Amino acid sequence: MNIFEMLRIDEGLRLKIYKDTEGYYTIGIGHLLTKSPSLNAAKSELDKAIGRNCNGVITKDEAEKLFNQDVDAAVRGILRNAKLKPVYDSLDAVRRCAAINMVFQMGETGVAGFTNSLRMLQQKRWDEAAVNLAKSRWYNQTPNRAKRVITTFRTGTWDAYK
Ligand SMILES: CCc1ccccc1
Ligand SMILES: [Cl-]
């Protein structure tokens, strides 16, 4: 298991514009296009991202290239953020994947607000961090996704994904 397989399981793959759990236009492996309610705005964002006139549909190769860019961007966002980087650098490789997963889903800004969880993770207080992570809108709105990610932080294993 690696971060790409983990996120592919959590996000799935759709080659036509779809709406995510919050109602936002998305494509591929969880690539957010826009928060605007306008499908035309989403189609324009897609064409800009891919570099051709897509009319709302992409190929599998295009979806996988966008996915690679999005994972790269999530990692860079962690490494540039003075609050996230020290915690990330303190984690083992499996728990680092759980960190990237959260940033991919919620953004650098959203995860950086989980201040109390971050401190517990840096101190390696895994059970306490798991309870704190679950006291969140995130857990209440996407509980199965959140349970898999939290279990990965708690155990440092891939067992939730196997
Ligand atoms: C709150 C999970 C996390 C930890 C470290 C870095 C990013 C995200
Ligand atoms: Cl869920």
Q: Is 55 left (phi over 0), alpha (psi -120 to 50) or beta?
A: left
Query: H-helix or E-strand containing 129?
Result: helix 126-134
Domain spans of the chain, in order of start: 3-161
Range 3-161 classified under CATH 1.20.1560.10? no
User: Which whole-number Å values give the CA distances from 112 to 16, 119, 131, 162, in the listed order?
Assistant: 31, 11, 18, 28
Instruction: Give resolution, Å, one decimal.
Output: 1.4
132 lines ligand 1 (CB under 6 A): no
Any known ligand binding at 117?
yes
Which residue, 133, 49, 26, is CA-closest to 87?
Answer: 133
25 lines ligand 1 (CB under 6 A): no
